Amino acid sequence: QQSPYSAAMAEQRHQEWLRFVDLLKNAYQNDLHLPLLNLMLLPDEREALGTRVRIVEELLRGEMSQRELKNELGAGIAMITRGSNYLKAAPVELRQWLEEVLLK
Amino acid sequence: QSPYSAAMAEQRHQEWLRFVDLLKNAYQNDLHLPLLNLMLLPDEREALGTRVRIVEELLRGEMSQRELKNELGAGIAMITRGSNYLKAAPVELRQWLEEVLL
Ligand SMILES: O=C(O)Cc1c[nH]c2ccccc12
Ligand SMILES: O=C(O)Cc1c[nH]c2ccccc12
């Protein structure tokens, strides 16, 4: 269970997140995803997301070394550990799909 | 802009488009929810949800600055930035947001 205060906040955040997810879903369908994402994300946030994709890809590929991840993608040991933990916690279905699309 | 900086900027642009395409394909495979949980921290997802509300209420024009602050945590500087983003957006996006958010 959860206390009513925390539960009320969590439900609000949940509904607000689903609204963003659905808004972006429809933007993709209307070819408006690029301007929507420029509106909703700062330039440095967009860059971070692009870099996180590369970190995920190289973690799954298994070829880049720790020094290379730091020097090429700015990912130190703490960030590599976090990213690896996120991948382990993700559903197997997502990980397998990521391997197919990113390591194509 | 030097060739070095231009080359870096183009690489960042391609990396961003790669994320955009990855998420597009995740939506098509109904894997967008777990992908977004992997790619975004909880506090980042919350911020995106709140930014949608700020955009909505700025377009609606009903809430006052104080209400935007109390309900959405959006101070005066964030309201100014959000308003600038909306003004710089293409007309097609603004027209669509007015149709769906309002
Ligand atoms: O400016 C910020 O603090 C982040 C931000 C990015 N897109 C936005 C849209 C509306 C309100 C705030 C933001
Ligand atoms: O932990 C972070 O620093 C942010 C982050 C969120 N998703 C990620 C995936 C790979 C690498 C870093 C992150």
Q: Work out the minimum CA distance from B8 to partner chain A, whole angstroms.
A: 11
Residue B57 CA to ligand 1 center (angstroms) comes to: 13
Distance, in Å, from the CA atom of B73 to the CA atom of A70, rounded to the nearest integer, reads 35
Question: Resolution of the coordinates in A?
Answer: 1.5
Residues spanned by the domain of B17: 1-102
By what method was this entry solved? Answer: X-ray
Would the CB atoms of B15 and A40 count as touching at under 8 Å? no
Distance, in Å, from the CA atom of A75 to the CA atom of B34, rounded to the nearest integer, reads 22
Q: Is B97 in the pocket of ligand 1 (CB under 6 A)?
A: no
| Gyration radius of chain B over CA positions | 17
DSSP strands (E only) in A28-93: none
3-class DSSP assignment, residue A41: coil
Total domains present in chain B: 1
Distance, in Å, from the CA atom of B60 to the CA atom of B53, rounded to the nearest integer, reads 10
Q: Give the CATH number, domain containing residue A86.
A: 1.10.1270.10
- Cβ-based interface (< 8 Å): residues of B facing A: 12, 15-16, 18-20, 22-27, 29, 31-40, 44-46, 48-53, 55, 85-86, 89-90, 92-93, 96, 100-101
Task: Give the amino acid at B11.
Answer: Q
- What is the number of residues in chain B? 102
Sign of CA dihedral A90, A61, B40, A67: positive
Distance, in Å, from the CA atom of A23 to the CA atom of A17, rounded to the nearest integer, reads 10
CB B55 within 8 A of CB B79: no
Nearest in space to A94 (alpha carbons), one of A60, A67, A44:
A60
